[PDB]
């Protein structure tokens, strides 16, 4: 799809890369 390419895209742009570490690093 490409309709949310604007929403779901930013909805978690980097906000995900920050939650993927704290859980992988500091766990």
For residues 3-22, b (16+ Cβ closer than 10 Å) or e, as one string? eeeeeeeeeeeeeeeeeeee
CA dihedral (8, 13, 17, 22) positive or negative = negative
- Using H for helix, E for strand and C for coil, what is the string for the chain? CCCCCCHHHHCCCCCCCCCCCCCCCCC
Method of determination?
NMR
What Cα–Cα distance (Å) separates residue 1 from each residue in 6, 7, 9, 19? Answer: 11, 12, 11, 25
């Amino acid at each position: 799809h490409i309709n949310e390419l604007l929403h779901i895209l930013v909805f978690g742009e980097s906000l995900l890369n920050d939650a993927v570490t704290v859980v992988l690093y500091k766990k």
